[PDB]
Design a binder for this molecule. Sequence first.
Ligand SMILES: CC(=O)N1CCc2[nH]nc(Nc3ccccc3)c2C1
Length: 107
Amino acid sequence: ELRQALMPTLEALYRQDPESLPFRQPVDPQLLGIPDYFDIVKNPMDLSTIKRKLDTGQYQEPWQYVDDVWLMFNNAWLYNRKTSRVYKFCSKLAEVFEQEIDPVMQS
Ligand SMILES: CC(=O)N1CCc2[nH]nc(Nc3ccccc3)c2C1
């Protein structure tokens, strides 16, 4: 529905390699060895969760989807250092999103 207008913006994020790679599944702190992650990031989000919410009709307005996208970005800028790989990958996704979402959010 509105799913149809938003889906391409989400595909644009997925298509970034390798920059989407830290963002494809939920952060798995046990596996990565980062036990402080849930102390810092109170509300985790990732592409796989946004894609499920999108497919199951959980975004009723466009701002709800944009909110989860930026929750994913803001979480990563918070947790990771400015000098870090994952922080820089997040910056690239945010550039790509700005480009894709703007004309969609006009139409
Ligand atoms: C998104 C985020 O804030 N993560 C916590 C730190 C971190 N370190 N490494 C990752 N995940 C990752 C990095 C490169 C490739 C695949 C997964 C992550 C995920």
